[PDB]
Amino acid sequence: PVSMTKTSVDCTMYICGDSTECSNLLLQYGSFCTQLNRALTGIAVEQDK
Amino acid sequence: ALDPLSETKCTLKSFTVEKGIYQTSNFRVQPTESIVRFPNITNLCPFGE
C-alpha cells in the first residue's frame, strides 16, 4: 500500500449544525476544532508527499 | 469579513501570510422560509350539540 483516502471533518456543524446558540456555548471551549483540522490537513499534505 | 484574504489573516492570527492554500469558512445556502404540515384532520368535536 502507498496512500490512503484523505479526509476532512468540520468540528462545528458536525458537533452541532444550524444552532447558533450551540456554537456560542461551543466557543466557550477554546480551539479544539482548529487543532483537529490541523491534524487532518497534516495527513492530507502527507499523502501527496 | 471585508474579503477572503482578511478572513485568512484573521484565522491565522497574523498580518502577513505566506504563499500557499488555506481552508476557511465552511458555508451553507442559508434556508429562507418556514413551512408546517399536518394531515387533513377534519373530524370535529360537536360543540353545536
Side-chain angles (χ1 to χ4, degrees), chain A:
Chain A
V2 169
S3 70
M4 65 180 288
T5 56
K6 316 155 66 171
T7 187
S8 163
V9 164
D10 187 13
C11 182
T12 65
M13 62 66 57
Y14 162 71
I15 292 311
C16 64
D18 186 74
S19 177
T20 308
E21 60 86 20
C22 174
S23 298
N24 296 139
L25 195 147
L26 185 54
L27 181 162
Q28 279 297 260
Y29 272 68
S31 63
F32 271 103
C33 310
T34 63
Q35 308 201 41
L36 302 191
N37 301 317
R38 276 204 302 255
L40 270 300
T41 48
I43 301 164
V45 163
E46 201 273 338
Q47 304 313 289
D48 283 331
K49 180 173 172 62

Side-chain angles (χ1 to χ4, degrees), chain B residues 8 11-12 17-24:
Chain B
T8 53
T11 191
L12 276 296
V17 178
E18 291 297 323
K19 171 202 60 47
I21 179 166
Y22 307 90
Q23 290 281 5
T24 77

Side-chain angles (χ1 to χ4, degrees), chain B residues 2-45:
Chain B
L2 174 63
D3 56 353
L5 180 55
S6 314
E7 184 143 19
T8 53
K9 283 186 181 161
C10 181
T11 191
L12 276 296
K13 304 152 300 312
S14 176
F15 289 162
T16 179
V17 178
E18 291 297 323
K19 171 202 60 47
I21 179 166
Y22 307 90
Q23 290 281 5
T24 77
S25 199
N26 181 16
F27 67 98
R28 191 167 34 70
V29 189
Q30 190 66 31
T32 187
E33 79 208 348
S34 297
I35 181 175
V36 58
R37 293 284 280 174
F38 283 124
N40 279 335
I41 200 165
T42 60
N43 49 0
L44 276 297
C45 297

